[PDB]
């Protein structure tokens, strides 16, 4: 009957592009946390 809202296909290919986005977000989140950790180390050092 068609006439509906996606999304739908095309798997693989679709994953190829999707995988490119969000990874860098995780990286900068981890780096942010690490910077906080080091900051706390300095706070402890003082």
């Amino acid at each position: 009957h068609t006439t509906l809202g996606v999304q739908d296909i095309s798997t693989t290919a679709m994953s190829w592009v999707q995988k490119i986005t969000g990874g860098v977000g995780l990286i900068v989140a981890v780096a942010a946390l690490i910077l906080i950790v080091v900051l706390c180390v300095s706070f402890s050092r003082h």
Binding site: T12, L35, L39
Partner: protein, 81 residues
């Protein structure tokens, strides 16, 4: 009609636009732009954090250099003269 092949990669992805559409792609593009902004914001934050690390050792006196390499690209180049 307007065959909506699968791929690929991507390629076909844009072919679907014709199939069910006006819209679809524009929203995805906006989402991509938002993702880019998040990526850019992260980088900006990272650079500020890199400053936060090089702070203390920003006054003067020997002490890196040293950890300035290994050293997140500045660190150095920075220690020197």
């Amino acid at each position: 009609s307007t065959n909506g092949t699968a791929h690929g990669h991507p390629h076909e992805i844009i072919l679907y636009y014709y199939e069910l559409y006006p819209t679809m792609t524009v929203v995805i593009v906006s989402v991509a732009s938002f993702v880019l902004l998040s990526m850019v914001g992260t980088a900006v934050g990272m650079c500020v954090c890199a400053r936060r690390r090089c702070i203390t050792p920003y006054e003067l006196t020997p002490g890196a250099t040293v950890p300035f390499l290994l050293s997140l690209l500045c660190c150095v180049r920075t220690t020197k003269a």
